Design a protein around this ligand. Structure first.
Ligand SMILES: *[C@@H]1O[C@H](CO)[C@@H](O[C@@H]2O[C@H](CO)[C@@H](O[C@@H]3O[C@H](CO[C@H]4O[C@H](CO)[C@@H](O)[C@H](O)[C@@H]4O)[C@@H](O)[C@H](O[C@H]4O[C@H](CO)[C@@H](O)[C@H](O[C@H]5O[C@H](CO)[C@@H](O)[C@H](O)[C@@H]5O)[C@@H]4O)[C@@H]3O)[C@H](O)[C@H]2NC(C)=O)[C@H](O)[C@H]1NC(C)=O
Ligand SMILES: *[C@@H]1O[C@H](CO)[C@@H](O[C@@H]2O[C@H](CO)[C@@H](O[C@@H]3O[C@H](CO[C@H]4O[C@H](CO)[C@@H](O)[C@H](O)[C@@H]4O)[C@@H](O)[C@H](O[C@H]4O[C@H](CO)[C@@H](O)[C@H](O[C@H]5O[C@H](CO)[C@@H](O)[C@H](O)[C@@H]5O)[C@@H]4O)[C@@H]3O)[C@H](O)[C@H]2NC(C)=O)[C@H](O)[C@H]1NC(C)=O
Ligand SMILES: *[C@@H]1O[C@H](CO)[C@@H](O[C@@H]2O[C@H](CO)[C@@H](O[C@@H]3O[C@H](CO[C@H]4O[C@H](CO)[C@@H](O)[C@H](O)[C@@H]4O)[C@@H](O)[C@H](O[C@H]4O[C@H](CO)[C@@H](O)[C@H](O[C@H]5O[C@H](CO)[C@@H](O)[C@H](O)[C@@H]5O)[C@@H]4O)[C@@H]3O)[C@H](O)[C@H]2NC(C)=O)[C@H](O)[C@H]1NC(C)=O
Ligand code: CTP
Ligand code: CTP
Ligand code: CTP
Ligand code: NAG
Ligand code: NAG
Ligand code: NAG
Lengths: 324, 324, 324
């Protein structure tokens, strides 16, 4: 009786009202494109004073729902295919030419051995390798990071979503928005929530991380765009909701393999027409854009069905009162 | 009685026959690779007459189940790290050197201020910035699009699918197909449905869009490959089905942030051995290849189970006739 | 009675114990980054002796949960925008200048026709096209593959997973691992299962494929990282499990469109400051990193619920004994 009343207020309140069992349900199809904007300034020894724009710091220039911003670098310039001393390690160091077998090439060595034992320094000797030479120096990445200015960059996240079942199509560039707004706006929770242009700093900040620490060794940042919509409500809700979360760094007590980095090169022909190359070991933050969402709308079918499934339990309450 | 007959013809006709409840069900594992083929010809002022092949128009040259074809460009050549006037805006324009604070660098400005107010034109003056100079001119992208010839390009979409539960493996390159066929064929609904090489024009066309309009500002095109298979039927069905849909452009009344474009650069060392750079703001169509599918096959287990679940409702019909 | 005992030992043994119906269930959120390491050596006619490092063989240098390693190439150097004979085909060959309509450009031709019929050889004549010239020669890719040394490369697969429902975060770089270990280790089943650095050779090998065959025409390799965890057990299990599978090559009887390859270019300005280009048709193996997993943990709610659903069937056994 109070059991009846409980499970009857349950198959209406819980499952019909609260769990939206009067609704058909579809899940989102999404597409995103991104654009980063900004300049960073570096002074190092020696490129002189250097500026990095979007075509300098986004590697590759286009990905599907992901973007990588360069933050720190170690740059080795004027490399050519030639011979040089390996960088000194237990594995590399040597006393005589005998220590170095010609042709020996192991995954963690600087190249293919000549092999000759040659001076790496005044003090140390090392196997001579055929490689892109000079080798990249062995150093920690700059702190503060070279590309620190990246914190002030902005990224337009453009997102088209569709809900096939409902013939529903929307963009995260909302109808109350227009071109001029995008000429100025930068997303803020308080004053500009509808601006789909985010300061990178703000993204990692809102995830409770510090851009200028992260930009040293790099990392991975998630951007979740959630479109959860009641289409029984007007089409004016069904707006996306952004949340930001740092994706790497699972056991932060660890100094083991921190951050994100990769090597890439730029190639040139010099005077003689022999390839010379610039190698960059870049650190940066990969930004993963992930889109989710579910749209309900009223249909009688799952309502009836859910009610039918509801009475089956609601009566079996009073049935199991006796049936034990 | 007619209620019985109705819900009994239901647990056979609806759920056992029509809804394939006699079947185990697995979902597809897929892998795709793509290849674009074609040349486009441009004449502009002034590169001279120029040809663009696959290595020119596909950025980057390889992605996982996505490919981007360049369609329109704005090209700024001979850039060097140097000083120049910002492009004139409310934000950039100035009267005195005082208007420009040295070092000021905002995300939407052309570079880092010197700062000096310098002539942009006869009429206007603008903050001098340290940047890649000259700056990209401010213009609309060419209509007709530079790379219009891209409409005639072809793309081989190669797709390997597998169904783990059924030990089932197939390719969208069908057994009735062979090498010569691929030497000539281009996919058509009527004469060549089994040719997995598609004219780009035909893809966007079949989605009811116009290539030569889209190629102006760019866009995103979906290609859905659906493998839905009854493996009780011979392995000769279980063929993929292609449908094409334009992914961006949710509220087409909008002039706000239309299409798809990105900036990318090519780098050179000049005589003096100082980096000079070509910058392209490219527009194009990203093609997203999306693969789905479900394979059923006969198993007794879910058949029995579904029947058992069927009688429970079929009898409870006659039970709720009285039980109200 | 033995029916009762059977279906009661079933709703405990099968569904409560074996199917873990006492458990809440969440599925994995994952992020991966990768790093390839190694040098390959080539001798060909004629680049001289050549070394390929990570920045040479990984195209593009960064992808999201995928990496492509170059294995074989066909390299055409010193290309310029200029006129040359098309490569001889039924489509290309000709007798008179009339055979070649100026401006004719079809997707499978080498360029835009001048059109002039010009000597391709002593024996054959072919339409002159405006193209990047000389054209890439028509040949099979080298066997053995140029980049065979790639078999010995290593790849660090770094994987961060999270389970939102359980506030659970882990990395595939396990707590019992540290920096030095990564300085030396290479994953083996027997001696080094916890080393997340894999020899490429071993990956394709363990999938029962032969690296030096695959590296000729290229291919697609899957790497599945499965995190399936009982969090009722200590956090010390909940380790990932790696399995490797070749993704392409569905109907291996086929010589039709085998492997994986793409064209890409490197651009240079020569003396005169006219663009010259190197074109590579590269073959290689794309490595797809795919992460899955499910975590259960004890909650009373689905336990009670499952038991309630269990008695409904357990009694209806004895009910349908009579009710037929
Ligand atoms: C293009 O799209 C834009 C974004 O949707 C539009 O901007 C929006 O425009 C409306 C008005 O056009 C803004 O409305 C607000 O109204 C409040 C009260 O206004 C009242 O003032 C009158 C005085 O004469 C009075 O008679 C009436 O009562 C009238 O209604 C204002 O107080 C309010 O100002 C502030 O409001 C928010 C703070 O809570 C904040 O969102 C606003 O931020 C905006 O301005 C600052 C700079 O001024 C920037 O930092 C932001 O980037 C942003 O532009 C502001 O601080 C405001 O006037 C509404 O705020 C505004 N939305 C935003 C966020 O801009 C444009 O109208 C569209 N343009 C065209 C051509 O249609
Ligand atoms: C490699 O793989 C290819 C694709 O599967 C194969 O091509 C297929 O080959 C068969 C025959 O080998 C084609 O069969 C069709 O048969 C019809 C009737 O043929 C009859 O003709 C005889 C006359 O002597 C008669 O005795 C018999 O009755 C015999 O059966 C033909 O009418 C038909 O022609 C048209 O059929 C379709 C139109 O509805 C259309 O698909 C065809 O398109 C093809 O041809 C045009 C150019 O001619 C191209 O635009 C297309 O690209 C395509 O090649 C054609 O218009 C046809 O002969 C079957 O059509 C064909 N499939 C396709 C699509 O090519 C090759 O046989 C394989 N090669 C090898 C070495 O095995
Ligand atoms: C950083 O992280 C590393 C990986 O977790 C750690 O390495 C691990 O360290 C422990 C010991 O520190 C290794 O433990 C094993 O213990 C066995 C028995 O040891 C016994 O020997 C004593 C003799 O005085 C005796 O008193 C005690 O009974 C003592 O317990 C050893 O037999 C065993 O050797 C072999 O064990 C495995 C074979 O079944 C195999 O995994 C090992 O491989 C390792 O060594 C070879 C080269 O020697 C390499 O090819 C591998 O790459 C690997 O390094 C070995 O063959 C071993 O000592 C445990 O094996 C080891 N794990 C691995 C895989 O290295 C480091 O300790 C951490 N470093 C720091 C600073 O903490
Ligand atoms: N294929 C690979 C990739 C990584 N490493 C090693 O794995 C450890 C951590 O990876 P990572 O953080 O990426 O190394 P880095 O600090 O960037 O150093 P390295 O320049 O050697 O990659 C390093 O000792 C690195 O040398 C390796 O030996 N084999
Ligand atoms: N990080 C970004 C990216 C975009 N934009 C602005 O967002 C608007 C629309 O984006 P998009 O269509 O990509 O701009 P474009 O027409 O290509 O112009 P722009 O060259 O400035 O990117 C433009 O006013 C653009 O300048 C911005 O201010 N901040
Ligand atoms: N857009 C495309 C892509 C592929 N092909 C043709 O499809 C067949 C097989 O594809 P693939 O294995 O990638 O060709 P390749 O052997 O690499 O030859 P090609 O250099 O012509 O691409 C070849 O005859 C290729 O020329 C084509 O005509 N149109
Ligand atoms: C480039 O390398 C050469 C030797 O290969 C060396 O002499 C010189 O330092 C480098 N040139 C420049 C531009 O510094
Ligand atoms: C490149 O820039 C210089 C000045 O930096 C200018 O004199 C010239 O127009 C450019 N050279 C070419 C190739 O046009
Ligand atoms: C580059 O091409 C020119 C003609 O365009 C040719 O003379 C020469 O073989 C090439 N130069 C080199 C570096 O071999």
């Amino acid at each position: 009786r109070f059991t009846q009343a409980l499970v009857i207020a349950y198959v209406i309140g819980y499952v019909c009202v609260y769990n939206k069992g009067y609704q058909d349900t579809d899940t989102v199809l999404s597409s995103v494109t991104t654009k980063v904007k900004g300049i960073a300034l570096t002074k190092t020894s020696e490129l002189g004073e250097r500026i990095w724009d979007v075509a300098d710091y986004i590697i590759p220039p286009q990905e599907d729902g992901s973007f990588f911003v360069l933050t720190n670098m170690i740059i080795t310039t004027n490399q050519t295919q030639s011979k040089c001393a390996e960088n000194p390690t237990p594995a590399s160091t040597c006393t005589s030419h005998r220590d170095c077998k010609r042709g020996f090439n192991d995954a963690r060595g600087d190249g293919v051995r000549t092999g000759r034992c040659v001076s790496y320094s005044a003090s140390v000797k090392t196997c001579e390798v055929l490689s892109w030479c000079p080798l990249e120096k062995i150093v920690d990445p700059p702190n503060p990071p070279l590309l620190a200015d990246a914190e002030r960059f902005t990224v337009l996240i453009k997102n088209n979503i569709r809900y096939p079942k409902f013939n529903f199509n929307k963009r995260n560039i909302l109808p109350n928005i227009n071109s001029s707004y995008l000429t100025h706006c930068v997303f803020s929770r308080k004053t500009d929530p509808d601006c789909p242009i985010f300061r990178l700093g703000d993204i990692v900040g809102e995830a409770e991380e510090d851009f200028q620490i992260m930009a040293v060794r790099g990392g991975v940042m998630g951007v979740q765009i959630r479109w959860d919509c009641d289409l029984d409500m007007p089409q004016s809700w069904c707006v996306p909701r952004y949340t930001f979360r740092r994706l790497d760094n699972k056991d932060p007590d660890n100094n083991v393999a921190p951050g994100y980095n990769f090597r890439f090169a730029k190639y040139y022909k010099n005077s003689d027409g022999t390839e010379t190359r610039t190698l960059i070991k870049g650190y940066g933050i990969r930004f993963d854009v992930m889109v989710f969402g579910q749209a309900g709308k009223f249909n009688i079918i799952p309502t009836l069905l859910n009610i039918g499934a509801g009475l089956a339990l609601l009566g079996l309450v009073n049935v199991i009162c006796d049936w034990i």
